[PDB]
Design a protein around this ligand. Sequence first.
Ligand SMILES: Nc1ncnc2c1ncn2[C@@H]1O[C@H](COP(=O)(O)OP(=O)(O)OC[C@H]2O[C@@H](O)[C@H](O)[C@@H]2O)[C@@H](O)[C@H]1O
Length: 167
Amino acid sequence: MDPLSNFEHKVITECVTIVLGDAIQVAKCYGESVLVNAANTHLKHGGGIAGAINAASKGAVQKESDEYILAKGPLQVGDSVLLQGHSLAKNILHVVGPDARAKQDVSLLSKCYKAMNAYPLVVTPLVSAGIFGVKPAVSFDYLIREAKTRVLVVVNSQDVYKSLTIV
Ligand SMILES: Nc1ncnc2c1ncn2[C@@H]1O[C@H](COP(=O)(O)OP(=O)(O)OC[C@H]2O[C@@H](O)[C@H](O)[C@@H]2O)[C@@H](O)[C@H]1O
């Protein structure tokens, strides 16, 4: 009855556990979880996890996101918005990490990860660690520092996983 017994994982803190795998697969195991999307300011879900989440939703995520942006305008870097879960999770928290390519302030990861504490169980990638160019260890450091809730941080690369878990 513990989904983590079926996954390669390491307990990091009493709050945070890191899992090697696919964040969408992990979130599907926890019906009351919130799944984080590593988004951009306009919720245009291209290429990384965001595109996978949109594909998993058969486009419904993008349609919702389109509507949201036209109603409310774009997010600022470091902001987040809770949107529907689309049967992937209870809800999807779209979080806008800093894009190092744009020279944005990496410390805005503090705000990103703080936004997760509103929810009792969160499944998240390492925000800003892919297309956005922030080192996985930097992103993980922020998460570890900020977490005050149950967080499953999920990494799809064994190489990233081992870089973060072997001490
Ligand atoms: N399904 C997944 N499960 C877990 N980890 C994942 C998954 N897919 C990607 N990753 C990893 O999650 C981290 C976050 O990577 P990105 O998705 O590229 O996120 P980010 O760097 O915040 O870039 C966001 C930007 O990319 C676009 O998808 C998004 O529209 C935005 O423009 C990276 O280490 C990436 O390899």
